[PDB]
């Protein structure tokens, strides 16, 4: 907070991670420090609406300074009214995404199922959300939201023809225009979620050079919650069909990926953690049967000096083979084991 | 305190003072003073004078003095750059004791270590003359950012610096007026003014 | 303002705002969410010296992960006094900008006749500028500048034998050592200004058929402005010779570009616009004799919540037609609507 | 600075600074202005153990709009202690820079002996850099610190398949695991410090491509400083072993380097400085024996208008003539003329 004028709350925030890692695979090995940066303003137009925007860049300092590798995290900006919903427009996270944060409670794994603009799984370009709080002021706990996806195509300084747009990606990031909404509950204690989306598939990825034909992806995500007493589990399942992206082979046809998390808060700040992921799929084509994309176990813990220095350990145990459905998709096999600490102001 | 040509080079001072200056010099220096606004004013008379900035540190290396040097070191090379080749006085407002001083040129340096003034001699349309300051004046047309100065134009730059003198001491002008015999009071004003620096 | 001590005082700004284009053009049809970052600090060396700075960078959100479309728009730094004028040096705008902002009001669309590293029309580098306030505490609204424009050229790490510079780019915005100025007039209300500017063309830039080649590329800029009583009424009319970009082509030998707006706001915070822009070209080169650049007519209005918060609405009628001379230098000639949400903090 | 509640405090800083080259080699001639913006981060975890962060971004403002050109400078985090030494791991300094710095004051050209990731020579990646104050507060002015380098290759996914690594570069800056510490002393006024670093090579820098082979790359630094009675005087000699790099056809054998320094302050704000930068190579594994690398002399003053906004002045003697060598090299060997105006927030 380094504004607090009148109608001009300006809550300036971000962070600093330092860390290592120590895997046999030299795809990942070395150093993995990155630093992100952003705000997060808010102005009271009036008692019932209110406006708010968030921000926030990340800039990786792995890079020599003869280069540069950064990106776009979430930047979006809209309008908040009073107990009626909310309607903002820009760069955010999706509908999916509302419900598999809870899973997703890792320090640095977690999250490995999904990618970035992996159609309404993560943050993307062109989201239209909108959020009601409360019911319209009826229920206490019970949210709902509703997401609206933007058409991407390939870039226009190549010529493509066929769907074209200004943001250009490659094919492995374009999507079309879909509808999507979500649904949860929150009691006292205990929580449960869903949510469910189906976005349109370009032509450009329906080709021969990627695996994976269909017209819709429409998905199905589950889930559970449970913080009290200091005490964290959560549980998901999610179905998605033609939305999982195995790797560099393009997409598989039927992919269902179930987590689980179980941490625990002590008073002196050590937090352990404990998660297990599966990726097996179901019906990949070129000639692979009930192969697994991705299996691992996550085991650490993480300790809090304080609200802005916290320290952790994470050891991913790969629990997935290495035949040649992994090497062509490049997956990664060996165990990473990384530590570090994040100052957050 | 006697100086030699005392009886002659004094008929021309009084023409020059009583029958030139009321008719070519004081008209024109009415208008200057009143059509010129104050800030154009301010601008030339800044610019004319970081023109010798860069001889003022010459002269006070040779005599020693690194304060003082460097004082003037700065100061062109502030107007040069952020004022607009010394339109704008930036070392002066920068600093209260960083004002532009009275400009030391090679006959200041010579008289430190002692140099009689010798005779004096009045010179036709210029006024006082001395073969030591006056004299010794014409030495920095060999330093650097004053070479390049031609010979048309540096007649008129001297004649700039007459007019804003002239037009400042208008507000004065009845002293030397009501002065019994002012070639005696201006002889000994200008040396006085001079002096060693 | 989020610090003020000792004299020096730091004033942060910046805009995000979610941009959507609907055109029946596949090349500018997307999203373009993009946001700007930057602050204001000045400081005062003492009672008749104060020194100030302005940074501004602008990001591009609507680009994947795996690529960055950040760019600075202006970085300048330099000192005033009391009432001497004043004086900077770097990244600015040029002398012409402060003309032709005048008719520069419209949301997001507008000001398309010009274009960025563009001589002496938008933000460059190597940019000196002079500029005087109220011609030396004067006459109050007579202002004027002086710029000067540095010799920007070839890339030097391209391996190019002629003359080449540092920070070099593409054989389109490169030029020479030109010296410009331009006056301006201010009254209650009523305003008449005008600019001149003038720059070489480097060797660079006559080497291939760029239609437009020249020793000079002088620009005659002039229009007027009013603005009074909640109206906002302005003109001008420029005369820019090898000066207008006609696209991939090259440069136009005459233009006479042409702009005029008309906005009126009222109390409950509507700002109705109305503006229309033509650009003839004239002495065109590759056979064309005379045909137009750019004309069309935009209307839109603005609606401010309280100070920063506003919802827009763009919808520009494009009046040029299809040929052989457009397709080449690549300008739609289709209609554009575009919807916004600017948040200003 | 912006920011201090419940003990967390932020000191934002940065620069803007605006460059002009006056020179005829073309190759650096031209506007260079860039940009420097960061935060530096602090928090109280007990009355014993605290916690620190600094970071800074650099961007060059002299480019043009379709093109960046930005990276990271210095990103690093850890925590400190009351008398028993901090610890931080990210990019930072290295233990050479710490005995370097002292004849690092000049205002433009300085410390062009050395480059960023070259054997431990200035910022790298994954340093772990361990610094106690006060010998435990035994003594006043003993400061020593230990560091370690990690290990980086050749770039990861392009035709690599040894020495591979996710922060992987070109050769020309690649390096091993070295370890090295550094130990100074300052009793009043005087100062007197020392470096030893070895730092290993990868397989990528011993190929014959490039000059310099060995196991291990030795560097030993010493120097001297005085600062008192507003004067400033430093020294230092430099001995690298195939550490110090010379253009882009590899590393030096055998180099000594020497660099000194003169400065002044005064009471009204000039800064005189003088520095005589002195390297001849020795040993050349390419017919070139005993020569001379980037040999020139500096000259220049700097005036502090205040303590947050100052200009100075800079001319470089290149005392270095045009042979063979410096033509496949890319040495400059002319006298170049640098100004700018710095302005720290
Ligand atoms: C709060 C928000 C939260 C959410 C809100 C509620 C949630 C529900 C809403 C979504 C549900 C809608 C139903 C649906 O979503 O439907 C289904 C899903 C069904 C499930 C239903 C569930 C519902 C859940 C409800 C939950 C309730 C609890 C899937 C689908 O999405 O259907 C798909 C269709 N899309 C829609 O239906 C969406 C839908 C959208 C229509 C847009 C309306 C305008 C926008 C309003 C702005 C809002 C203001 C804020 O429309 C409509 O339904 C009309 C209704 C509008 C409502 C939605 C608007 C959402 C905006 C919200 C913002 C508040 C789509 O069709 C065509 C579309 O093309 C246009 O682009 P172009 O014209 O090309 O530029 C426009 N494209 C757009 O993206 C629009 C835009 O970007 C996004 C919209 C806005 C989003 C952001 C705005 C927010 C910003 C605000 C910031 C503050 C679009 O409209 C147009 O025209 C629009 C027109 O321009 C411009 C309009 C003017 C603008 C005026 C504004 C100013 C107002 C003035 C005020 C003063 C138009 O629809 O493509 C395929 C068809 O396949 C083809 C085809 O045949 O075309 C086959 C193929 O063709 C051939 C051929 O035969 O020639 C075949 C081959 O042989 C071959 O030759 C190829 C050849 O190689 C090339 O040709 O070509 C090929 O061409 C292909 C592609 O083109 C290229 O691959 O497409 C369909 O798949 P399919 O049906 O499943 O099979
Ligand atoms: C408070 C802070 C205090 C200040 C800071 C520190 C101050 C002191 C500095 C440290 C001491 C210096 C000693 C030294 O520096 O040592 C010497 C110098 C001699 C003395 C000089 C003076 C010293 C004293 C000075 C006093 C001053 C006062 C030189 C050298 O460096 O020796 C070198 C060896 N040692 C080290 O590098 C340092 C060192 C290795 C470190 C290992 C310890 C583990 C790390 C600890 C974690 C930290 C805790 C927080 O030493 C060790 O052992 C253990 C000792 C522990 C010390 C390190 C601790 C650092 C922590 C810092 C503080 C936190 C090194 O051995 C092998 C290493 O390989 C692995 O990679 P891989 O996994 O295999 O890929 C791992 N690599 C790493 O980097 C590890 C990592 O990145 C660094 C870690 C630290 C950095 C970050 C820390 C901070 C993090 C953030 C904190 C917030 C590593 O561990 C491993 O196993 C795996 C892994 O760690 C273990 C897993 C993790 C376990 C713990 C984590 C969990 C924690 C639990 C918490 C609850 C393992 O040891 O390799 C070459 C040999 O050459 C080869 C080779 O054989 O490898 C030959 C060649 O091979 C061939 C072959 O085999 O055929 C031949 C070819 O023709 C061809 O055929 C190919 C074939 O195609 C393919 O093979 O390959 C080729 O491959 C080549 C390179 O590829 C190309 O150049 O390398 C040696 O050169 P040489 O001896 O000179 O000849
Ligand atoms: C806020 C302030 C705003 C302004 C204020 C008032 C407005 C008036 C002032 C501006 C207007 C000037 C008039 C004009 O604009 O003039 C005309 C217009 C006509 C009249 C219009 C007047 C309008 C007035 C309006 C009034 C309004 C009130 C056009 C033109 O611009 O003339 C052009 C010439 N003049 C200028 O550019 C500006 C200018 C010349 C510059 C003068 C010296 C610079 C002063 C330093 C600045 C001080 C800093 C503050 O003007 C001058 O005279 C003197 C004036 C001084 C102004 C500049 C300073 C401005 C800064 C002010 C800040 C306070 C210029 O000549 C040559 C120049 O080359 C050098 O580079 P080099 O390194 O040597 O290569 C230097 N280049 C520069 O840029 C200098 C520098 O970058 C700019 C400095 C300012 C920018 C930043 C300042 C601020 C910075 C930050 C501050 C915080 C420069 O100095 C030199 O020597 C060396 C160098 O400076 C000196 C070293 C530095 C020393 C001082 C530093 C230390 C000081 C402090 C110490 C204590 C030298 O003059 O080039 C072409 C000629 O064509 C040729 C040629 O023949 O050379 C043909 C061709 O040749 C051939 C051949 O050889 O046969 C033929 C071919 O077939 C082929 O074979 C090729 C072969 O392939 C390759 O060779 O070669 C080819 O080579 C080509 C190019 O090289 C390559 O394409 O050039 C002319 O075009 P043309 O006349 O139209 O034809």
Redesign the interface.
């Given at each position: 907070?380094?504004?607090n004028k009148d109608?001009?709350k300006?809550d300036?925030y971000?962070k600093?991670?330092?860390l290592?890692?120590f895997s046999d695979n030299?795809?990942?090995?070395?150093?993995?420090?990155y630093?992100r940066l952003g705000?997060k303003?808010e102005?009271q137009?009036?008692d019932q609406?209110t406006?708010?925007?968030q921000?926030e860049?990340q800039?990786?300092?792995?890079?020599?300074?003869?280069?540069?590798?950064?990106?776009?995290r979430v930047?979006?900006?809209?309008?908040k009214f009073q107990d009626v919903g909310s309607f903002?427009?820009?760069?955010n996270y999706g509908v999916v995404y509302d419900v598999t944060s809870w899973t997703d409670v890792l320090p640095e794994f977690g999250g490995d199922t999904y990618g970035?603009?992996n159609f309404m799984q993560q943050?993307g370009?062109?989201f239209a959300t909108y959020r009601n709080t409360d019911f319209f002021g009826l229920v206490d706990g019970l949210n709902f939201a509703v997401q609206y996806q933007?058409?991407?195509?390939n870039p226009?300084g190549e010529g493509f023809?066929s769907?074209?747009?200004?943001?250009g990606?490659?094919a492995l990031?374009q999507n079309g225009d879909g509808v999507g909404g979500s649904i949860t509950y929150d009691y006292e204690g205990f929580g449960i979620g869903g949510a469910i989306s189906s976005s349109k598939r370009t032509d450009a990825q329906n080709t021969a050079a990627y695996i994976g034909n269909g017209d819709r992806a429409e998905t199905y995500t589950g889930g559970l919650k449970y913080d009290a007493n200091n005490i964290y589990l959560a549980a998901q399942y999610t179905q998605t069909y033609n939305a999982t992206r195995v790797g560099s082979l393009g997409w598989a046809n039927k992919a269902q990926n179930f987590e689980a998390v179980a941490q625990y808060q002590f008073d002196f700040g050590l937090r352990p953690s404990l998660a297990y992921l599966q990726s097996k799929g179901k019906n990949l084509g070129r000639g692979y049967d009930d192969e697994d994309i991705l299996k691992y176990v996550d085991v650490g813990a993480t300790y809090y000096?304080?609200?802005?220095?916290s320290t952790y350990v994470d050891y991913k145990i790969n629990l997935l083979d290495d035949n040649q459905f992994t090497r062509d998709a490049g997956i990664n096999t060996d165990n990473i084991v990384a530590l570090?600490?994040?100052?957050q102001? | 305190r006697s100086d030699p040509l005392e009886g002659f080079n004094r008929t021309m001072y009084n023409f020059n003072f009583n029958v030139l200056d009321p008719y070519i010099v004081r008209p024109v220096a009415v208008a200057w003073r009143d059509y010129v606004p104050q800030p154009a004013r301010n601008g030339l008379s800044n610019f004319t004078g970081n023109l010798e900035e860069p001889a003022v540190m010459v002269n006070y290396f040779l005599q020693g003095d690194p304060y003082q040097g460097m004082v003037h070191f700065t100061r062109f090379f502030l107007n040069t750059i952020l004022g607009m080749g010394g339109f704008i006085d930036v070392a002066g407002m920068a600093n209260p004791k960083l004002q532009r001083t009275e400009p030391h040129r090679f006959g200041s340096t010579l008289g430190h270590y002692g140099v009689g003034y010798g005779p004096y001699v009045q010179l036709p349309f210029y006024g006082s003359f001395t073969l030591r300051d006056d004299g010794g004046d014409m030495a920095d047309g060999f330093y650097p950012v004053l070479s390049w100065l031609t010979w048309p134009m540096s007649v008129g730059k001297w004649t700039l610096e007459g007019i804003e003198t002239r037009a400042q001491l208008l507000d004065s002008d009845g002293l030397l007026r009501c002065s019994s015999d002012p070639y005696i009071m201006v002889r000994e004003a200008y040396f006085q003014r001079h002096d060693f620096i």
């Open positions: 907070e380094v504004y109608g001009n300006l300036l971000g600093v991670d330092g290592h890692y030299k795809d990942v090995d070395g150093d993995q420090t630093m705000f303003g102005t137009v009036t609406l406006g708010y925007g921000w860049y800039i990786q300092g792995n890079s020599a300074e003869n280069e540069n590798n950064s990106w776009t930047a979006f900006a809209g309008l903002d427009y820009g760069r970035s603009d943050r370009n062109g933007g058409k991407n195509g226009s023809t769907g074209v747009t200004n943001n990606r490659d990031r000096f304080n609200k802005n220095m570090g600490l994040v100052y102001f | -």
